[PDB]
Amino acid sequence: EVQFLRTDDEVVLQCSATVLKEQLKLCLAAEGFGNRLCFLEPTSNAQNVPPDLAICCFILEQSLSVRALQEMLANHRTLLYGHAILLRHAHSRMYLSCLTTSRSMTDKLAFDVGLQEDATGEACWWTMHPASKQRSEGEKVRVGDDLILVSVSSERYLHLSTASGELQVDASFMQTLWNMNPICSGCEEGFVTGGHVLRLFHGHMDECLTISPSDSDDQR
């Protein structure tokens, strides 16, 4: 059956931009530690230059209805259009939020999109909406669907801004179509999956593959 997105799954938020008469795919990314601001990591040239995908992965922590979220703030589900989702950054464990600052010069009504340490408030909650009439509110979000993300706290879209020379991501009143491509759903216990950090041991001899120590003559 057509695959659906569920909470605790891992996704990358992906958009596409036409640059020099060529379609280019980009993923939302953020370091978290040292820089809370989100940026766009291209992924169309993966054959020649691998993308830094470790920091583009988000986990769907929760997905409530709007009224349920209101009650929660006052005090493996399947995502449905019109629900509000919480996205946790896999690396830093911060949450994708609409910031109250703005460094943009092209747009005077845009806010910065970045990571936020805690999941308190409404800044970290986003509502999904169908991009086309093919889907409608209450329908299940289907893998590979283009959807529009709206901030719960600011009523702004997750927007790709090309006004300046470079591609940037902000929260504005213009809309952009994003894809929540799944990275992983659920792993059988004890089995290796891609995108994992691990050690490569020589058989069972307590010897691992490595590079030279920092400040070595071989340049590591």
């Binding site: 209805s65 009224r67 349920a68 209101q70 009650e71 006052a74 005090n75 209450g138």
Partner: peptide, 18 residues
């Protein structure tokens, strides 16, 4: 029926705190 169920769920969430 699905629309009605969603409306009833909204009503329950509205009244859950009360």
């Amino acid at each position: 029926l699905l629309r009605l169920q969603e409306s009833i769920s909204d009503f329950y969430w509205y009244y859950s705190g009360k």
